[PDB]
């Protein structure tokens, strides 16, 4: 990337800013901007790019071959009992939460077994997480 | 990318901004912008790009071959009992939640077994997560 | 990257900023900006790039072959009993949470078994985590 910005509230290239209880009297503003942005970005010049994959087997014997790629999800148990009894009680559960593995962002890129590539790979993430607000 | 912006509330290239209880009297504004943006971005020049995949087998013997790619989802148990009894109670569940793996964003890109590629791969994510607001 | 910015509240290339209880009287502003930005960024010049993968087997004997890539998820147990009884009680659970492995951002890039590549790989993350706010 070139210019990544995280902004709290306000972005202003020029900000003539006024707020509460202000006497804005007798002001003279003269402003000139000559803004130039010039970009020559990610330019590629290749005369020759060769990509070659070759597998050769000559009368061989193969047995018990197992190939498993990344992210091998197997045989998991989740158990969350919630056994609640009462005897003459006043229950006040205002903001109570039960969350099993809640996901927000899952960006999977280049997850394979055999891979050959040429070039550029780029991932950008912005957010404002707030999980819980209870008053 | 070139220009990624996360903005809190306001973006303004020029902001003549006024708010509450303001006496905006006798103001003279003169403003000139000469804004130039020039882009030559991701330009490719290739004379020769070769992509070649070859598999050759000569009278070989193959047995018990298993190939499994990424993301192998198998044999999972989720158990969330919720056993609730009462005896003479006042229940007040105002903002109570039970969530099993709630997903927001799942961006899968290039998830295979065998892969060959040339070029550019790009992912951009913005959001404003707030899960729960209870008053 | 070139310019990564984390901003608290406000970003302003020029900020003529006024707030509460201000007497802005008799002000004369003269402002000139000649702003030039020149970028020649990630430019590649390759005459020859060769990528070659070759596997050759000559009448060999293969058995009990197991290949497993990264992220091998197997055989996990989670058990979170919640056994609650009462006898004549006043329950006040205002902001109480139970979270098992809640995920926000999972960026997976280049997770394979065999990999060959040429180029640029880039990941950018901004956020404002706040998990819980209870008043
Ligand atoms: C604002 O400017 C004018 C002209 O220059 C002047 O007559 C006036 O008195 C000024 N205002 C104040 C409050 O001085
Ligand atoms: C910008 O405008 C002001 C206004 O008078 C002038 O004096 C200045 O020469 C200008 N500059 C350019 C680069 O145009
Ligand atoms: C790519 O094009 C030609 C071929 O090599 C080269 O002369 C030129 O300078 C390159 N372009 C850039 C922007 O570098
Ligand atoms: C491995 O080979 C033996 C006998 O050759 C067979 O019993 C077994 O099932 C094989 N393994 C798998 C995972 O199939
Ligand atoms: C605003 O400007 C005019 C002309 O310059 C002037 O007559 C007037 O008095 C000014 N206002 C104030 C409040 O001074
Ligand atoms: C912009 O406008 C102002 C207004 O008077 C002028 O003085 C200045 O020369 C101008 N600049 C350009 C670059 O046009
Ligand atoms: C691509 O086109 C020709 C062929 O190589 C080259 O001369 C030129 O400079 C390249 N273009 C750019 C924008 O670099
Ligand atoms: C592996 O081979 C054995 C005997 O050759 C067979 O019993 C078994 O089922 C094979 N494995 C699989 C996964 O089929
Ligand atoms: C503001 O400027 C004008 C002209 O220069 C002047 O007459 C006036 O008295 C000034 N204001 C104050 C409060 O002095
Ligand atoms: C910018 O504007 C001011 C306004 O008078 C002028 O004096 C100065 O020469 C200008 N500079 C350029 C580079 O345009
Ligand atoms: C790439 O293009 C030609 C070929 O080598 C070279 O002369 C030129 O200087 C390069 N471009 C840049 C921007 O370096
Ligand atoms: C390894 O080989 C033995 C006998 O050759 C077989 O019993 C066993 O199942 C093999 N292992 C696997 C994981 O298949």
Cβ of A45 closer than 6 Å to ligand 3, yes or no, is yes
Which tokens hold the place of A14?
Answer: 């020029």
Test the C interface: residue of A51, A59, A88, A135 with most C CBs within 10 Å? A51
β-bridge pairing B3-6 and C3-6: unpaired
Other chains touching C, judged by 3 or more CB pairs under 8 Å: A, B
- Write the residue in C32, C71, C97 that is nearest to A32 by C-beta: C32
Contact at CB, C129 and A129, closer than 8 angstroms: yes
Residues of C37-62 as b/e, b for ≥16 C-beta within 10 angstroms? Answer: eebebbebeeeeeebeeeeeeeeeee
CA C120 – CA B1 distance, rounded (Å): 13
Q: Does residue C111 belong to the interface with chain B, where contact is any CB pair within 8 Å? A: yes
Q: State the resolution, in angstroms.
A: 2.9
**Distances from the Cα of A97 to the Cα of A51, A76, B114, C92, C100, angstroms:** 53, 23, 43, 14, 11
CA B126 – CA B5 distance, rounded (Å): 9
Sequence length of chain C is: 135
First to last CA, chain B: 40
Those of residues 25-64 in A touching chain B at CB distance below 8 A are 25-64
Torsion from C-alpha of C85, C91, C96, C97, nearest 10 degrees: 30
In 3D space, the residue among B68, B65, B63, C59 whose CA is nearest the CA of residue A56 turns out to be C59
Closest CA of chain C from B132, distance in Å: 10
Which tokens hold the place of A104?
Answer: 């927000």
Which tokens hold the place of C81?
Answer: 């009993």
Closest CA of chain A from C65, distance in Å: 5
What was the experiment behind these coordinates?
A: cryo-EM
Whether the CB-CB separation of C73 and A69 falls below 8 Å is answered with no
CA A93 – CA C92 distance, rounded (Å): 6
Torsion from C-alpha of A53, A58, A60, A63, nearest 10 degrees: 30
Helix or strand run (H / E) with residue B24:
strand B22-41
CA A117 – CA A44 distance, rounded (Å): 15
Q: Does residue B81 belong to the interface with chain C, where contact is any CB pair within 8 Å? A: no
Which tokens hold the place of C101?
Answer: 């492995």
- Phi first, then psi, for residue C20 (nearest 5°) are -40, 145
- Write the residue in B37, B39, B90 that is nearest to A90 by C-beta: B90
CA B122 – CA B109 distance, rounded (Å): 9
Residues pairing with B37 in the sheet: A37
Residues 6+ apart with CB under 8 A from B134: A94, A95, A133, A134, A135, B94, B95
Cβ of C30 closer than 6 Å to ligand 10, yes or no, is yes
In 3D space, the residue among A86, A119, A51 whose CA is nearest the CA of residue C84 turns out to be A86
- Write the residue in B6, B8, B60 that is nearest to C126 by C-beta: B6
Ramachandran quadrant class, B2 (left: phi over 0; alpha: psi -120 to 50; beta: rest)? alpha
Residues pairing with A57 in the sheet: B57, C57
């Amino acid at each position: 990337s070139i210019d990544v910005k995280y902004i709290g509230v306000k972005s202003a290239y020029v900000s003539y800013d006024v707020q509460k209880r202000t006497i804005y009297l007798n002001i003279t503003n003269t402003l000139n901007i000559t803004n130039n942005n010039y970009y020559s970005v990610e330019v590629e010049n290749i005369t020759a790019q060769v990509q070659f994959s070759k597998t050769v087997i000559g009368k061989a014997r193969l047995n018990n071959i197992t190939i498993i790629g990344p992210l091998d999800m197997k045989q998991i148990d989740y158990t969350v009992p919630t056994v609640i009894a009462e005897e003459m009680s006043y229950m006040y559960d205002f903001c109570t939460l039960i969350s099993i593995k809640v996901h927000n962002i899952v960006l999977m890129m280049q997850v394979t077994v055999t891979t050959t590539y040429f070039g550029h790979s780029e991932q950008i993430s912005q957010e404002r997480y707030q999980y819980v607000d209870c008053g």
